Design an enzyme around this catalytic site. Structure first.
Site, PDB file in Angstrom:
ATOM      1  N   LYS A   1       3.550   2.560   0.226  1.00 44.16           N
ATOM      2  CA  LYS A   1       3.261   3.004   1.597  1.00 44.16           C
ATOM      3  C   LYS A   1       3.831   4.376   1.835  1.00 44.16           C
ATOM      4  O   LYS A   1       5.035   4.580   1.700  1.00 44.16           O
ATOM      5  CB  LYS A   1       3.815   2.015   2.640  1.00 44.16           C
ATOM      6  CG  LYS A   1       3.436   2.341   4.074  1.00 44.16           C
ATOM      7  CD  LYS A   1       3.958   1.293   5.033  1.00 44.16           C
ATOM      8  CE  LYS A   1       3.308   1.391   6.388  1.00 44.16           C
ATOM      9  NZ  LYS A   1       2.085   0.549   6.474  1.00 44.16           N
TER      10      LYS A   1
ATOM     11  N   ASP B   1       5.678  -6.578  15.300  1.00 40.20           N
ATOM     12  CA  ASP B   1       4.245  -6.293  15.241  1.00 40.20           C
ATOM     13  C   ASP B   1       3.535  -7.208  14.248  1.00 40.20           C
ATOM     14  O   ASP B   1       2.723  -6.752  13.420  1.00 40.20           O
ATOM     15  CB  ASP B   1       3.967  -4.816  14.922  1.00 40.20           C
ATOM     16  CG  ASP B   1       2.510  -4.406  15.120  1.00 40.20           C
ATOM     17  OD1 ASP B   1       1.826  -5.015  15.970  1.00 40.20           O
ATOM     18  OD2 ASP B   1       2.047  -3.496  14.408  1.00 40.20           O
TER      19      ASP B   1
HETATM   20  C1  LIG Z   1       0.005  -3.419   6.463  1.00 40.51           C
HETATM   21  C2  LIG Z   1       0.645  -3.642   5.136  1.00 40.51           C
HETATM   22  N1  LIG Z   1       1.867  -3.204   4.848  1.00 40.51           N
HETATM   23  C3  LIG Z   1       2.207  -3.596   3.550  1.00 40.51           C
HETATM   24  C4  LIG Z   1       3.579  -3.217   3.142  1.00 40.51           C
HETATM   25  C5  LIG Z   1       1.216  -4.307   2.889  1.00 40.51           C
HETATM   26  C6  LIG Z   1       1.184  -4.994   1.603  1.00 40.51           C
HETATM   27  C7  LIG Z   1       2.305  -5.313   0.815  1.00 40.51           C
HETATM   28  C8  LIG Z   1       2.043  -5.934  -0.438  1.00 40.51           C
HETATM   29  N2  LIG Z   1       0.784  -6.221  -0.893  1.00 40.51           N
HETATM   30  C9  LIG Z   1      -0.278  -5.864  -0.052  1.00 40.51           C
HETATM   31  N3  LIG Z   1      -1.529  -6.250  -0.564  1.00 40.51           N
HETATM   32  C10 LIG Z   1      -2.793  -6.055   0.058  1.00 40.51           C
HETATM   33  C11 LIG Z   1      -3.928  -6.620  -0.607  1.00 40.51           C
HETATM   34  C12 LIG Z   1      -5.220  -6.374  -0.112  1.00 40.51           C
HETATM   35  C13 LIG Z   1      -5.423  -5.570   1.042  1.00 40.51           C
HETATM   36  C14 LIG Z   1      -4.291  -5.036   1.694  1.00 40.51           C
HETATM   37  N4  LIG Z   1      -4.465  -4.160   2.911  1.00 40.51           N
HETATM   38  O1  LIG Z   1      -3.647  -3.289   3.122  1.00 40.51           O
HETATM   39  O2  LIG Z   1      -5.409  -4.345   3.649  1.00 40.51           O
HETATM   40  C15 LIG Z   1      -2.991  -5.270   1.234  1.00 40.51           C
HETATM   41  N5  LIG Z   1      -0.115  -5.250   1.184  1.00 40.51           N
HETATM   42  S1  LIG Z   1      -0.165  -4.511   3.911  1.00 40.51           S
END
Ligand SMILES: Cc1nc(C)c(-c2ccnc(Nc3cccc([N+](=O)[O-])c3)n2)s1
Length: 280
Positions: free
Chosen positions: A33, A118
């Protein structure tokens, strides 16, 4: 960042864009991120807040004024799973398992005085084993239209010193949405969000929420709507589920059930850990 090879853009979160990426040193596949000294200290504290129902924060990289957060990678979010399961519905034992695990995650963070603030299906991540995990925990305290659908009424009414109860409210809204396959309160403005809550749970007053009429954004001119029965709000959820939901959606944050007390609720007497049907 030379140590990370970006794979794809997996999402666009509230605090920045989330990428799937490969760690060239360890061969690890991660969620990267891309996002102030107070922020560095607070974010560093979240690296030690480890729980099986919390997406692990692997590293915090502060380079050229930019901040990168390296998370463990999960293959799907609950929003995508809910969309994929919309024609059939998520089976009730899996909804119960996910709610129970999320309550364990919240009970842990809340015991360490850490709030999410959130919660939304977009930051709840699932794996093939039946686990569900909370992402972006503690980022709101440190730092596309941001959804209001899961916002607690005390926040909408202008409470600046809100409590862990805000996360219980959000989780109750998500629980209702998994059961019915429709968002509980899909507001598209702050007043629409508040008035959607009032139309279902009744306009709050001094009886059900002492001090509500003195809140910063409270107006005596708010329309007075009667409360609806939960039997109408979340069919076909059983009485234990409706009782728990009602306690997660109490107006008064002080009356709202805690995550720890919610874990002891009779709704979880027969909880199990089913395997979801995941296509990746
Ligand atoms: C809003 C977020 N903050 C974090 C840190 C996120 C996070 C952390 C670990 N794995 C994933 N996998 C994932 C897999 C498919 C689609 C998505 N997407 O972002 O739509 C995410 N996301 S999602």
């Amino acid at each position: 960042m030379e140590n990370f090879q970006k794979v794809e853009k997996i999402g666009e979160g509230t605090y920045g864009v989330v990428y799937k990426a490969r760690n060239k040193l360890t061969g690890e596949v991660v969620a990267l991120k891309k996002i102030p000294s107070t922020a560095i200290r607070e974010i560093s504290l979240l690296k030690e807040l480890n729980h099986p129902n919390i997406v692990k924060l692997l590293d915090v990289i502060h380079t050229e004024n930019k901040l990168y957060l390296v998370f463990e990678f999960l293959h799907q979010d609950l929003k995508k799973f809910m969309d994929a399961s919309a024609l059939t519905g998520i089976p009730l034992p899996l909804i119960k398992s996910y709610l129970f695990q999320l309550l364990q995650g919240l009970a842990f963070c809340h015991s360490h005085r850490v709030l999410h603030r959130d919660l939304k299906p977009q930051n709840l991540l699932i794996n093939t084993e039946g686990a569900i995990k909370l992402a972006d925990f503690g980022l709101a305290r440190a730092f596309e239209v941001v959804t209001l659908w899961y916002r607690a009424p005390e926040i909408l009414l202008g409470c600046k010193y809100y409590s862990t109860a805000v996360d219980i409210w959000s989780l109750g809204c998500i629980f209702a949405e998994m059961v019915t396959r429709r968002a509980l309160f899909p507001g598209d403005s702050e007043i629409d969000q508040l008035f959607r809550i009032f139309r279902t749970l009744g306009t709050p007053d001094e009886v059900v929420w002492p001090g509500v009429t003195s809140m910063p954004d409270y107006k005596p001119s708010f329309p007075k709507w009667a409360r609806q029965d939960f039997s109408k709000v979340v069919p076909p959820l059983d009485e234990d589920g409706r009782s728990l939901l009602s306690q997660m959606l109490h107006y008064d944050p002080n009356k709202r059930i805690s995550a720890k007390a919610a874990l002891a609720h009779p709704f979880f007497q027969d909880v199990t850990k089913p395997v979801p049907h995941l296509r990746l």
